[PDB]
DNA sequence: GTACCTACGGCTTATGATTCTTCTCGCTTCCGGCGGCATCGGGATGCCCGCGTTGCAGGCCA
């Protein structure tokens, strides 16, 4: 929301690897889990 | 031995949009010059008489 741009991209690895970016075709990795540290930055 | 990314917040500066200033197209139509003729009020010219202009000398003012 702070900077919305369809061209702005740095990694793009997550969306490229989970789906094709639209998603009903490729539904690979139906189960995802996000492990994160217990600090405030986590 | 060294390089490149963003979040947390504020002012600015680097560029596409809207109200105020200005540059001047259209001719046409009611209106404003423009000329001629009868008209009328002023005045220049002449004569008479008293008042406006000026020189002299004194008392007042800047």
From Swiss-Prot:
- Impact of mutating residue 37 to A/N? Strongly reduced DNA supercoiling and relaxation activity. Reduces ATP hydrolysis in response to DNA binding, but has only minor effect on the basal rate of ATP hydrolysis
Species the sequence originates in: Escherichia coli (strain K12)
Residues noted as binding Mg(2+) 2 in the record, renumbered to the chain: 37, 39
Transmembrane segment boundaries: none
- The leader peptide range reads none
Q: What is the effect of changing residue 39 to A?
A: Strongly reduced DNA supercoiling and relaxation activity. Reduces ATP hydrolysis in response to DNA binding, but has only minor effect on the basal rate of ATP hydrolysis
Belongs to which family? Answer: Belongs to the type II topoisomerase family.
- In Swiss-Prot or TrEMBL terms, this protein is called DNA gyrase subunit B
- Where would you find this protein in the cell? Cytoplasm
Additional record remark: When the enzyme transiently cleaves DNA a phosphotyrosine bond is formed between GyrA and DNA in an ATP-independent manner. In the presence of quinolones this intermediate can be trapped and is used as an indicator of drug toxicity.
Domain comment as written in the entry: Consists of 3 domains; the ATPase domain (residues 1-220), the transducer domain (221-392) and the toprim domain (393-804). ATP-binding is cooperative, and both subunits must be wild-type at residue 103 for supercoiling to occur. Non-hydrolyzable ATP analogs (and ATP-binding) induce dimerization and enhance ATPase activity. ATP hydrolysis induces domain shifts that are probably part of the mechanism of DNA cleavage and rejoining.
Q: What is the lineage of its organism?
A: Bacteria, Pseudomonadati, Pseudomonadota, Gammaproteobacteria, Enterobacterales
Function field: DNA gyrase negatively supercoils closed circular double-stranded DNA in an ATP-dependent manner to maintain chromosomes in an underwound state. This makes better substrates for topoisomerase 4 (ParC and ParE) which is the main enzyme that unlinks newly replicated chromosomes in E.coli. Gyrase catalyzes the interconversion of other topological isomers of double-stranded DNA rings, including catenanes. Relaxes negatively supercoiled DNA in an ATP-independent manner.
């Amino acid at each position: 929301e702070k900077a919305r741009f369809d061209k702005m991209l740095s990694s793009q690895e997550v969306a490229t690897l989970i789906t094709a970016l639209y998603n009903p075709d490729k539904l690979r990795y139906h189960s995802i889990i996000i492990m994160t540290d217990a600090d405030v930055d986590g």
